[PDB]
Amino acid sequence: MEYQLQQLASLTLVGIKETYENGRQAQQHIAGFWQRCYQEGVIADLQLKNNGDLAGILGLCIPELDGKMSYMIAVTGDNSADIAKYDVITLASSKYMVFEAQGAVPKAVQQKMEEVHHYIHQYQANTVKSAPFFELYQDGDTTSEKYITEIWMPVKGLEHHHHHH
Numbered sequence: 074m075e076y077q078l079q080q081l082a083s084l085t086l087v088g089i090k091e092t093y094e095n096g097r098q099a100q101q102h103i104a105g106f107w108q109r110c111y112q113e114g115v116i117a118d119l120q121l122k123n124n125g126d127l128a129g130i131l132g133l134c135i136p137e138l139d140g141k142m143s144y145m146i147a148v149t150g151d152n153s154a155d156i157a158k159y160d161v162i163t164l165a166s167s168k169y170m171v172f173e174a175q176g177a178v179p180k181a182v183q184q185k186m187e188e189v190h191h192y193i194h195q196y197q198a199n200t201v202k203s204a205p206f207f208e209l210y211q212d213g214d215t216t217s218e219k220y221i222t223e224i225w226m227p228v229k230g231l232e233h234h235h236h237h238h
């Protein structure tokens with residue numbers, strides 16, 4: 074499968090985080106969460122705030138300690154803002170395997186994701202389960218079947234994988 078290696082320094086993310094029972098339940102409600110965020114003007118507001126560290130809006134899947142799964146819609150933002158209403162988190166530095174989904178959101182993303190999970194099955198010692206993974210949505214028309222969504226999966230010690238020697 075095609076992917077690019079990218080690295081990120083520590084980042085501050087601003088947005089809204091919701092929590093669901095598990096991965097399956099999250100998929101049922103994520104589309105709704107996005108719909109609610111757009112309708113209430115949250116997306117527009119968050120878009121004003123990105124300092125440009127990452128281009129776009131992020132949809133992060135965050136594992137919770139009790140087995141629950143959280144989803145956060147956010148942008149990379151500056152710490153120096155009052156920022157009372159929004160949820161804020163620090164995304165720890167990491168290296169990632171970055172994949173692309175070409176197509177209309179979100180079906181193109183879901184199908185690409187099933188594929189990604191299957192592919193990373195072979196990199197069990199390198200993937201980081203407790204670490205957040207995310208979809209990055211750049212400016213553009215989601216509807217177009219030429220639209221590209223980036224999927225960022227965090228990894229550790231990937232250089233040591235035998236397939237790379």
Ligand SMILES: CC[n+]1c(-c2ccccc2)c2cc(N)ccc2c2ccc(N)cc21
Nearest residue numbers: 103104105107108111130132178179210215
């Ligand atoms: C809920 C559909 N929807 C929309 C969307 C589509 C049409 C109008 C408004 C939002 C969306 C729009 C942007 N920019 C970025 C991500 C998503 C998204 C992501 C996941 C999902 N599961 C549904 C999603």
